[PDB]
Amino acid sequence: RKVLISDSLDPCCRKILQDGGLQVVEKQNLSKEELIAELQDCEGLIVRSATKVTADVINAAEKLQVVGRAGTGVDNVDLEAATRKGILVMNTPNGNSLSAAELTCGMIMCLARQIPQATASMKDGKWERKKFMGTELNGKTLGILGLGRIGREVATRMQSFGMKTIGYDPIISPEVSASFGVQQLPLEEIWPLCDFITVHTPLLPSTTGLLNDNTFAQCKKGVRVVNCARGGIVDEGALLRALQSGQCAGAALDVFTEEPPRDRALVDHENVISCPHLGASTKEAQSRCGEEIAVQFVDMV
Amino acid sequence: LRKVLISDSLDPCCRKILQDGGLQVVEKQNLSKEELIAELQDCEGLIVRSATKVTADVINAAEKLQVVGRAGTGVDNVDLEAATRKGILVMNTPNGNSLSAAELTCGMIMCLARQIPQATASMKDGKWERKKFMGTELNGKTLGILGLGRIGREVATRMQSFGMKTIGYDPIISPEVSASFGVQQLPLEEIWPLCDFITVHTPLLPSTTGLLNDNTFAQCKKGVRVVNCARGGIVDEGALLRALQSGQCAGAALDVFTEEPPRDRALVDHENVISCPHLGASTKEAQSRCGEEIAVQFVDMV
Ligand SMILES: NC(=O)c1ccc[n+]([C@@H]2O[C@H](COP(=O)([O-])OP(=O)(O)OC[C@H]3O[C@@H](n4cnc5c(N)ncnc54)[C@H](O)[C@@H]3O)[C@@H](O)[C@H]2O)c1
Ligand SMILES: NC(=O)c1ccc[n+]([C@@H]2O[C@H](COP(=O)([O-])OP(=O)(O)OC[C@H]3O[C@@H](n4cnc5c(N)ncnc54)[C@H](O)[C@@H]3O)[C@@H](O)[C@H]2O)c1
């Protein structure tokens, strides 16, 4: 059939599809009405995160058969509406892991030394040595919640800095985590030990507010936290209260409960470092995800 | 060997160690030239960090002064020539800062790969600009490390954990020794074309002033990224600006400048440059270690 790529993807996605004999239309930044119009001659749609595959789009897209997302999860696809119609939804759980792990490590280093703030200071003409006294990562404890693809890659990188890496994952055995140097403990034992906490779980009811007022209360005063997973795993209201009291000394956020976020209190806080969901924003990750999704479209004979 | 003036803001452990060694200590900070010379009247020892400027005039007016200690690397704020001519010993702390400087360098590499400082600035300006901040994955990329001493080797082993190939050069470290911490030595001319990132960890010497310059930038890959958390002037600042302006250099991270604070703002102002006010040693841990390291030398002196 014919596939529309409605967001900006690596050009290899397009190449692999055509090599498989498919018509492609590559057209970014479509309005809701433009998207529906294009799709009515299309059985495939491929998105990244910008296009919102809502029930209304799906319902109006009568010939649609498969929606592919070139990223993890299905955050911008109404999976329930797609399933109600006969529509397959596919994604790319492997292609961007390494890039996400690397950003998470960068964010830890940025929290330790306040590099983003120091650059902003310098650009205002300031030379603020005292303000930007930091902390050394060597000897500190990093808590890693979620020890799948990304969590284990964060662990081995941060171990090279001399960090003690502890963590928790309901599915990963202690024996598997020991093989990448992560000691598992129950959550209640993790909180008071950590200098830094990073989350690498899916977003589920059980992981929403994984860090919240109750768990911040149990942390070491001055804990630094990273969320490069999904918005909401760290409760944003709790995080702001923790930053306000000094219970959390800083946070680094790639992701938000709303993207772009309309509430600016966290982004605007002096001790918060942020990015516009750049975890998979590398040429390499994008090349890998574009291939991953294209191959899945070709493999359906 | 009796009274020591500590003239800059140091970790309190420096004072205690001197005092345990059996020395008198005066902590006074932010002194003018005249004030510094007056405090030194009864002092045979002076301990500084970076702000106090132990110039030829101070050295020559300070009558009982026998040793100057700097709680940091090199002798940037001490006229060592003047000191040596008058017979005054100068001591510094070559070990205490290594790990904090290595960590900052690695943080700078990550920031250049993913534009985290620029991304934060954009978000704080109320923007959501994903495409602009498309970055580079470190795995498989080549990092060139010039200077393979205390800091170079620590940077190498950390960036190796990211899957970077670490190559470099040091005139005194043998290829066999550098091999033992995973750094492949090659001649400089073979390095430039191979590097995705270059980081410098040398002293500032005639051999290292302008080690990166217009000619070496022309030998590099289009889009090379450069880090200087060592000393200002190892990367020629004019050459670096020209390379940033043409795109030969995709970005640079600078902790150090030929003038500090720098009066010329062109590099700091460039959108592809990330910077810090010489924070390589600016951690609680490093400052503690340096404070200990310099007081301990003074006490052995007794
Ligand atoms: N910021 C980005 O651009 C970016 C990029 C890629 C992935 N991600 C996100 O990062 C997260 C991790 O991705 P991954 O590829 O490593 O996923 P993965 O499935 O390999 O691993 C996730 C792990 O989380 C664990 N988990 C579930 N509930 C948990 C809980 N309550 N406590 C601790 N662990 C729990 C699972 O057991 C699993 O092992 C996901 O949310 C993913 O969407 C973000
Ligand atoms: N930004 C900061 O706050 C900060 C903090 C600590 C140290 N430093 C600086 O970082 C630099 C490295 O310090 P270190 O402790 O690793 O020093 P080190 O003495 O242990 O190592 C320096 C190495 O540079 C090498 N070298 C000399 N000339 C060279 C050349 N032409 N090419 C390649 N290598 C050359 C030497 O042979 C030596 O092995 C110094 O300039 C030091 O002052 C900066």
XYZ file of C-alpha atoms and ligand atoms in Angstrom:
691
model
C 0.000 0.000 0.000
C 0.744 3.782 0.439
C 2.331 5.258 3.609
C 2.324 8.860 4.856
C 5.184 10.058 7.011
C 3.666 13.088 8.801
C 6.638 13.975 11.029
C 10.356 14.574 10.508
C 12.158 11.214 10.289
C 15.574 10.087 9.132
C 15.432 9.665 5.284
C 16.297 5.913 5.616
C 12.714 5.254 6.754
C 11.487 6.425 3.349
C 14.230 4.425 1.544
C 13.452 1.100 3.213
C 9.696 1.506 2.490
C 10.171 2.201 -1.214
C 12.711 -0.637 -1.468
C 9.803 -2.766 -0.215
C 7.634 -1.389 -3.055
C 5.520 1.168 -1.139
C 4.342 4.627 -2.165
C 5.474 7.212 0.401
C 4.310 10.758 1.031
C 6.570 12.686 3.419
C 4.859 15.828 4.699
C 5.613 17.464 8.058
C 3.603 20.028 10.083
C 0.158 19.120 8.685
C -2.930 20.684 10.229
C -5.595 18.277 11.547
C -7.581 18.872 8.373
C -4.512 18.508 6.112
C -3.588 15.220 7.798
C -7.056 13.697 7.331
C -7.093 14.776 3.670
C -3.725 13.119 2.902
C -4.542 9.910 4.767
C -7.727 9.040 2.823
C -5.602 7.435 0.077
C -3.260 5.819 2.708
C -3.226 2.492 4.596
C -0.067 3.332 6.604
C 0.821 6.354 8.753
C 4.226 6.902 10.334
C 4.722 9.460 13.140
C 7.337 10.547 15.650
C 5.797 12.679 18.473
C 4.381 15.831 16.787
C 1.421 14.317 14.930
C -1.495 13.544 17.199
C -3.263 10.403 16.014
C -6.503 11.099 17.838
C -9.717 9.065 17.580
C -11.130 11.729 15.235
C -8.197 11.290 12.828
C -8.476 7.493 13.041
C -12.258 7.556 12.515
C -11.939 9.895 9.512
C -9.078 7.766 8.111
C -11.317 5.013 6.754
C -8.620 3.282 4.646
C -5.956 3.363 7.430
C -4.584 -0.058 8.570
C -1.322 0.479 10.473
C 0.125 3.373 12.454
C 3.849 3.319 13.262
C 5.550 5.532 15.808
C 9.320 6.019 15.479
C 9.900 6.045 19.249
C 9.004 4.221 22.479
C 5.442 3.887 23.792
C 2.314 5.165 22.066
C 2.022 8.587 23.685
C 0.660 10.355 20.578
C -1.549 7.492 19.279
C -4.991 6.750 20.688
C -4.278 3.013 20.941
C -7.847 2.326 22.163
C -9.429 4.023 19.125
C -7.017 2.246 16.766
C -7.826 -1.148 18.299
C -11.590 -0.462 18.094
C -11.060 -0.174 14.333
C -8.909 -2.812 12.626
C -5.682 -0.815 13.045
C -2.263 -2.180 14.003
C 0.038 0.109 16.031
C 3.820 -0.528 15.967
C 6.785 1.247 17.540
C 10.557 1.132 18.064
C 11.561 0.060 21.588
C 15.265 -0.506 20.793
C 16.537 2.230 18.490
C 16.826 5.142 20.873
C 17.905 3.507 24.180
C 21.578 4.375 23.972
C 20.908 8.053 23.154
C 18.483 8.285 26.063
C 21.044 6.714 28.413
C 23.705 9.212 27.303
C 21.459 12.231 27.881
C 20.572 10.904 31.363
C 24.288 10.695 32.181
C 24.841 14.224 30.855
C 21.969 15.472 33.013
C 23.547 13.896 36.145
C 26.821 15.700 35.397
C 24.947 18.955 34.768
C 23.206 18.677 38.156
C 26.495 18.023 39.894
C 28.203 21.146 38.450
C 25.378 23.432 37.202
C 26.812 23.721 33.702
C 23.625 25.094 32.049
C 23.244 27.774 34.697
C 26.924 28.654 34.592
C 26.724 29.131 30.809
C 23.672 31.367 31.254
C 25.567 33.367 33.897
C 28.606 33.796 31.646
C 26.383 34.902 28.779
C 24.954 37.656 31.006
C 28.554 38.868 31.522
C 28.858 37.426 35.029
C 31.819 35.588 36.565
C 30.155 33.805 39.510
C 32.618 31.478 41.131
C 31.011 31.144 44.568
C 27.460 30.642 43.323
C 28.489 27.582 41.264
C 30.424 25.508 43.797
C 29.385 21.946 42.995
C 29.812 18.350 44.003
C 32.028 15.493 42.876
C 30.301 12.354 41.595
C 33.023 10.002 42.830
C 31.817 8.217 45.970
C 28.156 9.248 45.599
C 25.165 6.891 45.400
C 22.904 6.850 42.301
C 19.501 5.186 42.619
C 18.198 3.809 39.304
C 14.483 2.935 39.156
C 13.903 0.737 36.135
C 16.732 -1.581 35.149
C 15.751 -2.432 31.580
C 17.367 -1.155 28.395
C 18.247 2.346 29.530
C 18.685 1.860 33.273
C 21.452 -0.682 32.875
C 23.362 1.545 30.350
C 23.168 4.499 32.772
C 24.561 2.218 35.519
C 27.748 1.088 33.738
C 28.583 4.643 32.558
C 28.096 6.158 36.000
C 30.089 3.358 37.695
C 33.115 4.649 35.696
C 32.733 7.912 37.654
C 32.989 5.994 40.905
C 29.290 6.164 41.708
C 27.661 3.440 43.770
C 24.652 2.283 41.709
C 21.666 0.793 43.504
C 18.178 0.346 42.179
C 14.857 -1.410 41.811
C 13.001 -3.255 39.091
C 10.058 -5.605 39.685
C 10.951 -7.967 36.742
C 14.757 -7.932 36.786
C 16.265 -10.525 39.072
C 18.964 -9.540 41.554
C 21.286 -11.823 39.592
C 20.731 -10.042 36.308
C 21.248 -6.583 37.921
C 24.408 -7.791 39.727
C 25.855 -8.596 36.291
C 25.857 -4.843 35.515
C 26.867 -3.799 39.031
C 23.476 -2.692 40.382
C 22.486 -3.842 43.880
C 18.716 -4.111 44.144
C 16.957 -3.101 47.353
C 13.316 -2.402 48.251
C 12.282 1.212 47.492
C 11.994 2.092 51.148
C 15.721 1.318 51.602
C 16.756 3.176 48.470
C 15.405 6.634 49.301
C 17.618 7.495 52.292
C 20.790 6.267 50.518
C 20.736 8.294 47.309
C 22.571 11.468 46.357
C 21.085 11.164 42.920
C 17.907 9.406 41.609
C 17.096 8.633 37.994
C 13.927 7.028 36.627
C 13.793 4.653 33.645
C 10.386 2.999 33.831
C 7.352 3.027 31.581
C 4.547 5.381 32.551
C 1.892 3.243 34.291
C -0.498 3.783 37.198
C 2.105 2.049 39.385
C 4.879 4.427 38.274
C 2.947 7.737 38.285
C 4.341 9.755 41.146
C 6.989 7.095 41.779
C 8.692 10.120 43.316
C 6.116 12.206 45.159
C 5.755 14.033 48.497
C 5.856 10.803 50.469
C 8.980 9.507 48.802
C 10.762 12.903 48.787
C 10.180 12.944 52.545
C 12.262 9.764 52.821
C 15.150 11.011 50.682
C 18.411 12.505 51.842
C 18.149 16.316 52.111
C 19.672 17.772 48.923
C 18.935 14.812 46.642
C 19.241 15.519 42.920
C 16.769 13.891 40.518
C 16.636 13.162 36.814
C 13.581 12.362 34.718
C 14.426 11.452 31.114
C 11.690 8.785 31.038
C 8.064 10.068 30.939
C 6.438 13.115 32.411
C 4.583 12.288 35.620
C 6.830 9.535 36.964
C 8.253 12.298 39.149
C 5.200 14.160 40.463
C 5.708 17.738 39.269
C 3.924 19.417 42.178
C 5.896 17.343 44.698
C 9.112 18.130 42.891
C 8.461 21.855 43.076
C 7.710 21.617 46.810
C 10.959 19.653 47.296
C 12.982 22.225 45.346
C 11.368 25.038 47.386
C 12.345 23.537 50.765
C 15.810 22.362 49.698
C 14.827 18.745 50.156
C 15.738 18.455 46.459
C 18.774 20.535 45.517
C 18.152 20.229 41.746
C 16.389 18.375 38.977
C 16.867 17.699 35.291
C 13.749 17.132 33.225
C 13.564 15.961 29.561
C 9.884 15.117 29.864
C 6.682 16.655 31.228
C 3.070 15.676 31.942
C 2.179 18.136 29.210
C 4.502 18.792 26.217
C 5.181 21.621 25.783
C 4.301 22.317 29.394
C 1.896 25.146 30.096
C 2.866 25.314 33.779
C 6.298 27.009 33.876
C 7.106 26.923 37.617
C 9.496 23.962 37.362
C 11.183 25.037 34.097
C 11.673 28.521 35.537
C 13.238 27.321 38.803
C 16.930 28.222 39.202
C 17.849 24.636 40.134
C 16.024 22.949 37.282
C 17.744 21.960 34.035
C 15.496 21.037 31.123
C 15.310 19.983 27.506
C 12.424 19.678 25.075
C 12.255 15.867 25.168
C 15.629 15.394 23.413
C 16.310 11.863 24.709
C 16.178 10.309 21.233
C 17.308 13.463 19.386
C 20.556 12.249 17.893
C 21.254 11.523 14.255
C 22.115 7.953 15.191
C 19.026 7.154 17.317
C 16.840 8.709 14.641
C 18.516 6.585 11.935
C 17.986 3.447 14.034
C 14.300 4.181 14.813
C 13.524 5.115 11.210
C 14.932 1.769 10.065
C 13.216 -0.153 12.937
C 9.736 1.090 12.023
C 10.289 0.820 8.228
C 11.411 -2.819 8.434
C 8.239 -3.648 10.370
C 6.131 -2.103 7.597
C 8.084 -4.114 4.981
C 7.938 -7.393 6.957
C 4.150 -7.463 6.675
C 4.797 -9.216 3.385
C 58.420 28.938 60.272
C 55.769 30.220 62.716
C 52.940 32.416 61.372
C 50.929 31.709 58.178
C 48.492 34.154 56.569
C 45.717 32.495 54.583
C 44.544 35.285 52.242
C 41.806 33.616 50.149
C 38.704 31.558 50.943
C 39.926 27.974 51.608
C 38.422 24.853 53.172
C 38.563 25.163 56.958
C 40.699 21.992 57.145
C 43.765 23.894 55.932
C 43.766 26.069 59.084
C 43.189 23.118 61.456
C 46.060 21.063 59.983
C 48.467 24.011 60.144
C 47.323 24.569 63.727
C 47.748 20.870 64.596
C 51.244 21.027 63.067
C 51.968 23.805 65.579
C 51.576 26.921 63.414
C 49.787 30.223 64.027
C 47.169 31.005 61.393
C 45.451 34.205 60.256
C 42.525 33.896 57.838
C 41.820 37.261 56.203
C 40.297 37.607 52.720
C 39.805 40.306 50.026
C 42.905 42.297 51.049
C 44.261 45.261 49.086
C 47.946 45.376 48.123
C 48.852 47.582 51.138
C 46.714 45.490 53.532
C 48.271 42.233 52.297
C 51.794 43.632 52.846
C 50.848 44.824 56.376
C 49.401 41.418 57.381
C 52.490 39.693 55.989
C 54.814 41.789 58.225
C 54.914 39.038 60.900
C 54.335 36.139 58.438
C 56.808 33.636 57.020
C 54.063 31.756 55.141
C 51.266 32.815 52.797
C 48.519 30.576 51.458
C 46.350 31.687 48.507
C 43.847 30.170 46.080
C 43.423 32.312 42.904
C 42.127 35.789 43.906
C 45.206 36.963 45.855
C 47.880 38.242 43.486
C 51.336 37.477 44.856
C 53.101 39.918 42.563
C 56.767 40.931 42.490
C 55.848 44.006 44.546
C 54.263 41.877 47.313
C 57.137 39.344 47.348
C 59.754 42.135 47.590
C 57.938 44.062 50.367
C 57.245 40.918 52.460
C 60.338 40.678 54.699
C 59.863 37.507 56.779
C 58.153 35.609 53.952
C 59.819 32.236 53.230
C 57.097 30.151 51.531
C 54.001 30.780 49.436
C 51.383 28.027 49.011
C 48.717 27.972 46.262
C 45.651 25.745 46.864
C 45.316 24.805 43.215
C 47.395 23.699 40.256
C 50.098 25.761 38.521
C 51.252 29.162 39.801
C 48.945 31.508 37.930
C 48.589 34.106 40.700
C 52.177 33.836 41.984
C 55.158 35.579 40.323
C 57.352 32.474 40.589
C 60.287 34.243 38.926
C 60.222 37.002 41.566
C 59.815 34.424 44.323
C 62.797 32.322 43.113
C 65.071 35.373 42.801
C 64.338 36.360 46.433
C 64.737 32.738 47.630
C 61.107 32.089 48.551
C 59.752 28.558 48.122
C 56.505 28.107 46.213
C 54.267 25.069 46.757
C 50.951 24.077 45.142
C 48.481 21.171 45.141
C 48.921 19.042 42.021
C 46.663 16.173 43.166
C 43.611 17.543 44.988
C 41.709 18.874 41.933
C 42.218 16.103 39.407
C 38.951 14.243 39.820
C 36.720 17.331 39.889
C 38.400 18.705 36.748
C 38.063 15.334 34.947
C 34.359 15.215 35.892
C 33.694 18.759 34.589
C 35.471 17.918 31.314
C 33.264 14.878 30.823
C 30.192 16.958 31.663
C 31.351 19.476 29.018
C 31.690 16.711 26.387
C 28.068 15.604 27.064
C 26.817 19.177 26.990
C 28.453 19.705 23.575
C 27.074 16.457 22.208
C 23.458 17.240 23.251
C 23.327 21.033 23.658
C 21.922 20.776 27.187
C 22.896 24.369 28.207
C 21.287 25.828 25.075
C 18.226 23.598 25.521
C 17.752 24.807 29.083
C 18.093 28.423 27.913
C 15.491 27.865 25.203
C 13.027 26.257 27.657
C 13.532 29.144 30.130
C 12.709 31.493 27.256
C 9.364 29.646 26.896
C 10.262 27.794 23.698
C 9.939 24.135 22.591
C 12.534 23.777 19.802
C 13.341 20.116 19.256
C 14.822 20.211 15.751
C 17.378 22.864 16.661
C 18.901 20.651 19.346
C 19.436 17.484 17.355
C 22.626 16.011 18.768
C 25.313 13.362 18.542
C 25.550 9.952 20.178
C 28.946 9.369 21.742
C 29.153 5.608 21.264
C 31.694 4.868 18.550
C 32.959 8.466 18.286
C 36.673 9.322 18.700
C 37.903 11.545 21.545
C 41.410 13.020 21.179
C 43.110 13.745 24.528
C 46.189 16.028 24.501
C 47.952 15.680 27.854
C 47.801 12.238 29.421
C 48.773 13.027 33.000
C 46.565 13.125 36.085
C 43.429 14.500 34.433
C 43.788 13.208 30.862
C 43.805 9.597 31.964
C 40.756 10.049 34.211
C 38.804 11.662 31.390
C 39.843 8.748 29.111
C 38.534 5.943 31.367
C 35.223 7.701 31.948
C 34.593 8.423 28.269
C 35.635 4.867 27.376
C 32.575 3.704 29.339
C 30.471 5.560 26.756
C 32.068 3.536 23.955
C 34.326 6.388 22.777
C 37.607 5.556 21.152
C 40.218 7.515 23.068
C 43.350 8.553 21.193
C 45.877 11.181 22.210
C 49.369 12.497 22.669
C 51.801 13.274 25.493
C 55.535 13.819 24.999
C 56.507 12.090 28.283
C 53.986 9.223 28.550
C 54.975 6.209 26.441
C 52.473 4.561 24.106
C 52.717 1.422 26.304
C 51.815 3.313 29.432
C 48.908 5.137 27.778
C 47.782 1.780 26.362
C 47.334 0.599 29.938
C 44.551 3.197 30.502
C 43.113 2.704 27.048
C 44.569 5.678 25.179
C 46.149 5.068 21.792
C 49.005 7.444 21.149
C 49.674 8.751 17.694
C 51.550 11.761 16.284
C 49.573 15.006 16.469
C 49.212 15.197 12.696
C 47.467 11.809 12.682
C 45.124 12.865 15.512
C 43.411 15.944 14.074
C 41.674 14.134 11.160
C 40.375 11.314 13.416
C 38.638 13.301 16.157
C 34.986 14.005 16.718
C 35.903 15.626 20.063
C 39.218 17.093 21.278
C 40.042 17.885 24.887
C 43.247 19.448 26.304
C 44.840 18.594 29.653
C 48.338 20.103 29.461
C 50.087 22.800 31.465
C 50.359 26.174 29.767
C 53.877 26.226 28.271
C 55.543 27.549 25.126
C 55.020 24.084 23.633
C 51.263 24.259 24.456
C 50.247 27.894 23.837
C 48.073 27.760 20.694
C 48.377 23.958 20.493
C 45.056 24.276 18.652
C 45.303 27.101 16.160
C 44.115 28.042 12.628
C 46.314 25.376 11.040
C 45.251 22.486 13.273
C 41.573 23.434 12.893
C 42.015 23.110 9.108
C 43.323 19.541 9.653
C 40.318 18.553 11.816
C 37.010 17.044 10.692
C 34.336 19.513 9.701
C 32.223 19.864 12.836
C 34.798 18.903 15.447
C 33.886 19.803 19.043
C 36.572 21.153 21.398
C 36.928 21.260 25.215
C 39.375 23.383 27.213
C 39.157 22.903 30.995
C 42.956 23.193 31.385
C 44.367 26.700 30.892
C 43.318 29.611 28.709
C 45.479 30.024 25.626
C 46.111 26.318 24.909
C 43.367 26.631 22.295
C 44.026 29.904 20.443
C 40.916 31.951 21.108
C 40.970 33.895 17.813
C 41.413 30.661 15.858
C 38.590 28.988 17.767
C 36.216 31.872 17.071
C 37.082 31.765 13.391
C 36.506 27.971 13.368
C 33.138 28.375 15.138
C 32.205 31.119 12.647
C 32.937 29.002 9.570
C 31.496 25.787 11.004
C 34.857 23.944 11.024
C 34.201 23.694 14.764
C 30.552 22.759 15.628
C 31.019 23.820 19.270
C 33.362 24.403 22.167
C 33.256 24.239 25.920
C 35.523 26.620 27.839
C 36.199 26.708 31.620
C 39.322 28.835 31.137
C 40.372 31.932 29.219
C 43.545 33.918 28.495
C 41.999 36.688 30.616
C 39.810 35.820 33.624
C 37.170 37.146 33.668
C 37.470 37.660 29.927
C 36.976 41.175 28.594
C 36.514 39.905 25.009
C 33.021 38.445 24.856
C 32.878 37.020 21.326
C 33.475 33.363 22.239
C 31.260 33.357 25.370
C 28.506 35.026 23.339
C 28.633 32.505 20.496
C 25.572 30.220 20.514
C 27.758 27.111 20.060
C 29.993 27.873 22.986
C 29.292 26.646 26.501
C 31.273 28.121 29.361
C 31.927 28.242 33.076
C 33.800 30.723 35.333
C 36.828 28.417 35.909
C 34.885 25.881 37.980
C 37.062 22.834 37.244
C 38.171 22.716 40.914
C 35.015 24.196 42.341
C 33.592 21.344 44.371
C 33.426 20.887 48.133
C 35.509 17.729 47.817
C 38.314 19.222 45.681
C 38.583 22.318 47.864
C 38.822 20.104 50.965
C 41.552 17.971 49.378
C 43.555 20.982 48.182
C 43.264 22.683 51.594
C 44.633 19.536 53.242
C 47.305 18.981 50.548
C 48.869 22.458 50.987
C 48.671 22.640 54.808
C 50.320 19.192 55.027
C 53.355 20.349 53.004
C 53.719 23.396 55.260
C 53.699 21.127 58.354
C 56.300 18.693 56.991
C 58.288 21.899 56.360
C 58.281 22.131 60.150
N 13.347 10.869 27.023
C 13.342 10.147 25.908
O 13.481 10.772 24.711
C 13.239 8.657 25.925
C 13.839 7.862 24.945
C 13.707 6.481 25.029
C 12.951 5.921 26.059
N 12.318 6.730 26.963
C 11.531 6.192 28.083
O 12.397 5.661 29.059
C 11.746 4.645 29.806
C 12.602 3.377 29.846
O 12.764 2.838 28.555
P 13.502 1.415 28.433
O 13.648 1.336 26.946
O 14.659 1.246 29.316
O 12.278 0.488 28.882
P 12.399 -1.054 29.226
O 11.064 -1.638 29.079
O 13.530 -1.813 28.646
O 12.667 -1.038 30.782
C 11.723 -0.495 31.665
C 11.846 -1.218 32.984
O 11.029 -0.513 33.912
C 10.586 -1.464 34.828
N 9.534 -1.050 35.757
C 8.178 -1.107 35.612
N 7.604 -0.646 36.753
C 8.578 -0.329 37.638
C 8.549 0.191 38.931
N 7.393 0.432 39.560
N 9.747 0.402 39.585
C 10.943 0.160 38.952
N 10.957 -0.327 37.656
C 9.798 -0.574 37.028
C 10.205 -2.681 33.976
O 10.136 -3.796 34.827
C 11.356 -2.691 32.957
O 12.442 -3.574 33.285
C 10.375 4.501 29.146
O 9.418 5.290 29.823
C 10.612 5.033 27.740
O 9.448 5.436 27.058
C 12.482 8.079 26.911
N 39.888 24.142 35.004
C 40.401 23.871 36.207
O 39.790 24.330 37.338
C 41.588 22.998 36.456
C 41.690 22.206 37.599
C 42.804 21.369 37.791
C 43.814 21.365 36.846
N 43.715 22.199 35.769
C 44.732 22.225 34.702
O 44.598 21.079 33.837
C 45.855 20.799 33.225
C 46.215 19.329 33.454
O 46.554 19.094 34.808
P 47.108 17.680 35.315
O 46.961 17.657 36.775
O 46.570 16.586 34.480
O 48.667 17.880 34.944
P 49.782 16.728 34.817
O 51.057 17.448 35.110
O 49.471 15.558 35.639
O 49.739 16.296 33.275
C 50.072 17.219 32.270
C 50.572 16.458 31.082
O 50.615 17.355 29.997
C 51.692 16.849 29.216
N 52.170 17.729 28.173
C 53.098 18.723 28.257
N 53.225 19.246 27.024
C 52.420 18.599 26.161
C 52.186 18.721 24.798
N 52.817 19.634 24.063
N 51.252 17.907 24.206
C 50.601 16.941 24.936
N 50.851 16.827 26.273
C 51.735 17.651 26.882
C 52.794 16.459 30.192
O 53.788 15.606 29.614
C 51.960 15.851 31.307
O 51.895 14.415 31.295
C 46.819 21.815 33.810
O 46.856 22.923 32.956
C 46.188 22.212 35.138
O 46.611 23.486 35.603
C 42.609 22.975 35.546
